Every structure is written in structure tokens, then in C-alpha cells.
Amino acid sequence: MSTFRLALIQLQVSSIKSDNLTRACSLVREAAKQGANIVSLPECFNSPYGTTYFPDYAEKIPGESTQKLSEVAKESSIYLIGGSIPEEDAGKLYNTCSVFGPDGSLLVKHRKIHLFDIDVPGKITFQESKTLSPGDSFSTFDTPYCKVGLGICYDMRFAELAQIYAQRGCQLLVYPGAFNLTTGPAHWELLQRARAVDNQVYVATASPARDDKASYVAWGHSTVVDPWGQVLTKAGTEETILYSDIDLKKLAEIRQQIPILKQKRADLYTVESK
Amino acid sequence: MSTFRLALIQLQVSSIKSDNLTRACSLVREAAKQGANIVSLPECFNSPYGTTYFPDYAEKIPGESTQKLSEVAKESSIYLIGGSIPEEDAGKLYNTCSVFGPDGSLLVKHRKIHLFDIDVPGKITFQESKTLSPGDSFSTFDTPYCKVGLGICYDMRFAELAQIYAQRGCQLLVYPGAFNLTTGPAHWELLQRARAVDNQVYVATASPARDDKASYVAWGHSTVVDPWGQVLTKAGTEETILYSDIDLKKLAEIRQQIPILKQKRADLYTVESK
């Protein structure tokens, strides 16, 4: 129970939802065949990423996409982190990561908390909040190995989320997400290394594969980082399944060697969750 | 006053305190001559770093070392961040960074909050709390350009300190410190880049030069990082003065482009301070 196999599906995403679902589910099955215990799909894995796409590809949960995820998690007896999909609920749209357990049960649903609203002149302008609404809950789930915490993409820029997850006992944080050709080289690896080292947790990112013709061009480079801040493995830009064997004994040893989680000064500061 | 010149004195530290003070003050004068507005010395700049050294090199504040720093800040008309020195007060010893303004006045004194207590088997064991006591206050000072926040070395591992400084309006964080041949390659650059990008501030580290014969062998590599997480400049291992022109207009533009400080979810989390 000290080591488990994590698989990150760096899916090539097309404009045809059923195509994405077919290929996503077949890659999940392959990951399970190669011994993965936890599998993650990437952000917006079932449809193109963009504000004019979300309304038309959005589904209720349960719906077409989550029913397929549920079924494949059950048939493969794995924990399946469902990347994210656009979700409709009560006249609002969300960017939502659904997680299914080895019995097909929904364990948790994470609606992206911090929406992707940036403007880098001459590089990338995105206003996710013009169509989507933000989530208002912390999201974790339990496995036999450890507790896992969730964020989606831009959520990775907010240190407090990882701090709260670490407080709550999470030992792996998974962030389905797609950075771009500007934010990718600058920030993608740095941010996930920061989250890992500062909170002494494993961190994994699940990105779609790069499609240079898409309106939003994904960085790629799905990555796993250990509690020492070391990159354990890193994909390229192409479609692949990335595997890592997550060693929780190593985490325990790191937390003893440089014991920053036990050295916090609660008389001076605290990160409070509401 | 949107740009100012920062100098980091990467001092080679000897066992003779007066030698360190002589050379520190001459390098400060040189930095001021080359137009530095804020100058920082490194951690434990006046004496060898180690638990059996602190008691014997410790001084009260004011004392020999701080009197020299006060005088040189006065005569050079600069803000001088006094690295750190071992400080004695009321039967206790601290690791203390004293800051003097252009009139020679003490602006603030930062006693290291998180003491350097680690044990990496086969590599480095240090127990700063054998002899030192921790500080219990946040430390900032004002300049005509911006507010500056302070930590010493291991303080840099504690994200919350930088979060609180950013809340309080700091635009530059300075950490005098010496990592070692184990923690240096793993964590030195990562941590400072994390503090910079997460809080959208400039971050600077002032290390002593490496002495391979010292009991604690310093990593070196004094560094300045911008709010985009980009390394602006980085020293080698040898004694030098590192200069950087800190562009606060750039900081303001970054905080608009990726406006994470304005996108915090205070309904879900807060970093609370004493």
C-alpha cells in the first residue's frame, strides 16, 4: 500500500465529442492493463477548449461523458480522474473534474475554483468567466494508498489550495490542465514543482496533447513531481500515456529529513479554509 | 522612482570577525559607488556559520558589527540589509538581519523565524535550534521605491511568510541565506522562483561565497527573480557583487496580465497573520 501506479492520459482532443470519449475510454483501459491504479484524463478532454465551445458541448452530470467514465472505471477497477468537461447546472456552466472509483461510483466533483482570465499582450487573451462560473468547494478523494486533492489548470496558480489540501492529509495533488506556448515554458513546470516542494506532496499534471491548429494550443508535457521538487517523469507534446510509480515511503522520508510541515509557526500565521 | 538598483554582496566569510567587517563595509561602499540604492550582505556574514561558533561571535545590537553597518549606510546614503549576524539578547541567541537606512537609522531587525533543523542522511545534518532561538515577528521596511520584506535562509521554505509580506504590500523580498551542496541544486532556485511567481514580487537571495574548507559549505549563487518567476541574474560560487535594476513598472504589468492577487477566493481561504 506504499506504492501505486499513476497514469496520465495525454489525449489528443478533436472537435467530435464521441471521438474523444471513444479514444479516452480505450486509453483508460490500456492504462489499467499496464497496472495503473489511478488514471487521469486531461482538462476539457471531451471537447475543444474555448468560451464559444463550452455552451454547446456542456452536459449535465450524469450525462453522456460521465456515464462512459463511470463504466470504464468500474470495468477496469481503477480510480479515474475524469480530466474536466464543461458541465451545465441550473443555467450555469462549469469546468468540472469528476472522479470515479473502482466500483463506478462518483467520489467527488471539482468545479474549477479560479477561472482562466488572463491577458498577455500579443500572446494570449482568455476570459473563461465570460461563459463559465467558478466552483466553491475543496475536492479530495480517498484511495487505499492515500488521499488525493484536485485542481484544474489555473487553480495551480493559487498556493493556498495546495496548502489546504496538504493540511487535510493529501499526499498526491492532480491538476488536469493545459497551459499554452506562452505560459507553458514560463510557469508550467515551476508551479507544479512549487506545489510539490512547499507542501511535501506528489504533484501530477494531465494536459491534452498539442494540436497546433486548435484555437488554444496546449503546451503538453504532462508531468509528475515528487515531494523533493524533483521531476519524476515528463511527457513530450504528442499523445501518450505517462506512467509513474508513486512511492509514498519516499514522501514519508522527505517529510522527516526537511520537516517543514512540522515546523510551521501557527502562533504567527495560518492558512484558514472556510 | 519605479526602478532602483539592488546589489547583493556575495562575501567570502573568514574566521576573523574584524576581517569580515572590514571587507563587508568596503564592498558596501563599492556597491553604493556603482549606484546601488539597496544593498544586501549575506547570512552570517561576520562569522563562521555553525552552532559552536554562534555563542562566541554573538553580539548585542547595537554592537561592533551593527555600528559599522550603521556608519557605512549613513556615509553611502543607502538602504543596507545587514545579512545576518548572531545576536545575543537576554541569555538567548538569534540569527538576526538588521536593516539600516540612508541616515544610519535601524529600520527593522528580523530574527530568523524558522530555524535550520534538518537531517539528510549521508549529506547534511544541522540543528540551529541547539543554540539559537526563533524570532516571532514579520519584518518589513519602506524605501521611496517600494516596501521590502525579509526572511533568512530556511525562512524561504515557508510559503506563508511571503504570502503575508505580499498582502502587506511588499514588492521585493530579500532572503540572506546559504544553502549547501545538497539543498542548493535541489531547492535554492526553485524556492525563490516559487516565492516570486506565486506572490508576484521580486525575490533576491544573498549568499556568502563558497568556501570548500568551511564546516558548512555554501552553495553560493546569489540570485534575483522577477514576478514572472524569471531569473534576472545569478552569481557563481566566488566572491562578487551582483547588481540588478529592479523594474517596478514590469511588476505592475505582470500583476495586470495574470492578475492572481486580484483573483484570490477570500470566501474559501485566507492566510491569517498575528
Side-chain angles (χ1 to χ4, degrees), chain B residues 4-10 38-40 156 171-175 188-189 191-197 201-207 220-236 241-248 250:
Chain B
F4 64 94
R5 316 157 166 178
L6 178 63
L8 305 175
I9 301 175
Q10 180 157 296
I38 304 182
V39 179
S40 192
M156 204 165 68
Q171 293 174 252
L172 169 70
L173 306 183
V174 182
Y175 298 89
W188 176 252
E189 190 165 286
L191 291 168
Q192 55 199 297
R193 293 183 67 204
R195 299 286 159 270
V197 75
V201 291
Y202 286 91
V203 177
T205 46
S207 178
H221 300 293
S222 299
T223 299
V224 182
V225 184
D226 76 13
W228 194 248
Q230 186 167 314
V231 174
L232 293 188
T233 191
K234 181 161 68 167
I241 306 178
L242 188 69
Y243 297 93
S244 183
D245 289 320
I246 304 298
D247 181 352
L248 300 175
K250 193 171 91 177

Side-chain angles (χ1 to χ4, degrees), chain B residues 25-26 28-29 67-78 80:
Chain B
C25 290
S26 55
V28 170
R29 292 179 192 101
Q67 289 293 298
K68 282 197 78 75
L69 293 169
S70 175
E71 289 167 343
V72 74
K74 250 167 285 178
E75 295 188 295
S76 304
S77 205
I78 57 166
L80 179 54

Side-chain angles (χ1 to χ4, degrees), chain B residues 13 32 34 37 72 85 97 115 153 156 164 173 202 219 235-236 252 267:
Chain B
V13 177
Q34 302 300 337
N37 305 298
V72 74
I85 68 174
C97 172
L115 300 182
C153 205
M156 204 165 68
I164 290 161
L173 306 183
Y202 286 91
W219 175 239
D267 59 311

Side-chain angles (χ1 to χ4, degrees), chain A residues 258 260 263, chain B residues 114-116 118 152-158:
Chain A
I258 301 179
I260 63 186
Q263 289 165 330
Chain B
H114 309 87
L115 300 182
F116 179 46
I118 71 164
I152 299 160
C153 205
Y154 204 62
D155 281 338
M156 204 165 68
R157 291 194 182 269
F158 296 84

Side-chain angles (χ1 to χ4, degrees), chain A residues 231-245:
Chain A
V231 173
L232 294 185
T233 190
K234 177 164 64 174
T237 59
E238 302 97 333
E239 182 171 82
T240 196
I241 307 176
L242 186 71
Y243 297 94
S244 182
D245 287 300

Side-chain angles (χ1 to χ4, degrees), chain A residues 157-175:
Chain A
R157 290 194 183 269
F158 296 83
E160 295 92 326
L161 183 55
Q163 288 167 311
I164 290 162
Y165 288 144
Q167 285 176 2
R168 293 179 182 195
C170 293
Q171 291 187 10
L172 171 68
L173 308 180
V174 182
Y175 297 89

Side-chain angles (χ1 to χ4, degrees), chain B residues 59-254:
Chain B
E59 291 172 17
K60 297 198 165 62
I61 293 178
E64 173 185 351
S65 298
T66 51
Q67 289 293 298
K68 282 197 78 75
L69 293 169
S70 175
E71 289 167 343
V72 74
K74 250 167 285 178
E75 295 188 295
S76 304
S77 205
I78 57 166
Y79 293 87
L80 179 54
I81 301 174
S84 72
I85 68 174
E87 177 191 12
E88 180 67 4
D89 180 337
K92 288 169 181 159
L93 298 176
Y94 304 88
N95 187 332
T96 303
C97 172
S98 56
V99 183
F100 297 90
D103 66 335
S105 179
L106 183 73
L107 300 181
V108 70
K109 96 176 168 191
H110 187 257
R111 294 171 169 179
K112 193 170 183 173
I113 288 168
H114 309 87
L115 300 182
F116 179 46
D117 288 353
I118 71 164
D119 199 354
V120 183
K123 293 190 253 164
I124 173 67
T125 301
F126 206 100
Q127 192 77 354
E128 193 167 47
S129 66
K130 271 179 193 269
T131 273
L132 301 192
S133 294
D136 54 17
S137 53
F138 299 97
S139 308
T140 67
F141 69 97
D142 292 313
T143 70
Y145 322 108
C146 67
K147 190 186 289 192
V148 180
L150 298 164
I152 299 160
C153 205
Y154 204 62
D155 281 338
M156 204 165 68
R157 291 194 182 269
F158 296 84
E160 295 93 326
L161 182 59
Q163 288 168 311
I164 290 161
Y165 288 144
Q167 286 178 355
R168 294 180 182 195
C170 293
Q171 293 174 252
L172 169 70
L173 306 183
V174 182
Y175 298 89
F179 276 29
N180 53 69
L181 268 35
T182 298
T183 57
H187 303 139
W188 176 252
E189 190 165 286
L190 169 59
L191 291 168
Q192 55 199 297
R193 293 183 67 204
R195 299 286 159 270
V197 75
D198 281 352
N199 305 292
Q200 308 200 299
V201 291
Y202 286 91
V203 177
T205 46
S207 178
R210 183 173 305 172
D211 178 358
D212 288 302
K213 299 162 212 60
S215 46
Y216 185 78
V217 181
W219 175 239
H221 300 293
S222 299
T223 299
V224 182
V225 184
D226 76 13
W228 194 248
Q230 186 167 314
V231 174
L232 293 188
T233 191
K234 181 161 68 167
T237 61
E238 301 96 333
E239 179 174 271
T240 195
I241 306 178
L242 188 69
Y243 297 93
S244 183
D245 289 320
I246 304 298
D247 181 352
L248 300 175
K249 189 169 184 42
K250 193 171 91 177
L251 173 153
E253 176 66 11
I254 291 164

Side-chain angles (χ1 to χ4, degrees), chain A residues 60-209:
Chain A
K60 299 202 168 58
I61 292 178
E64 179 182 346
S65 297
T66 50
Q67 289 163 0
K68 288 189 198 316
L69 293 173
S70 176
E71 178 178 358
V72 73
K74 180 181 163 186
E75 294 190 296
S76 301
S77 292
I78 58 169
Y79 293 84
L80 178 57
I81 300 171
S84 73
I85 69 177
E87 178 191 12
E88 178 178 355
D89 179 339
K92 298 154 286 93
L93 301 174
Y94 302 89
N95 187 331
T96 303
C97 173
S98 50
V99 180
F100 298 89
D103 63 334
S105 183
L106 181 74
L107 299 183
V108 71
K109 181 169 83 171
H110 188 257
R111 297 169 164 180
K112 192 171 181 176
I113 289 162
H114 308 87
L115 299 183
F116 180 46
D117 289 351
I118 70 165
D119 196 355
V120 183
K123 302 283 192 178
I124 173 65
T125 303
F126 206 100
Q127 188 78 348
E128 193 169 49
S129 69
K130 81 204 238 172
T131 301
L132 303 187
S133 296
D136 54 18
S137 53
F138 298 99
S139 308
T140 64
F141 68 97
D142 289 307
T143 69
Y145 322 106
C146 66
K147 189 185 287 191
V148 180
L150 299 161
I152 297 159
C153 206
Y154 204 61
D155 280 336
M156 206 165 66
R157 290 194 183 269
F158 296 83
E160 295 92 326
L161 183 55
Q163 288 167 311
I164 290 162
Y165 288 144
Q167 285 176 2
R168 293 179 182 195
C170 293
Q171 291 187 10
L172 171 68
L173 308 180
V174 182
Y175 297 89
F179 278 28
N180 53 66
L181 273 32
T182 298
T183 57
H187 304 139
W188 175 252
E189 190 166 284
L190 170 57
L191 290 170
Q192 59 195 294
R193 294 183 66 205
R195 299 287 160 270
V197 76
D198 280 351
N199 304 291
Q200 305 196 303
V201 292
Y202 286 90
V203 177
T205 47
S207 177

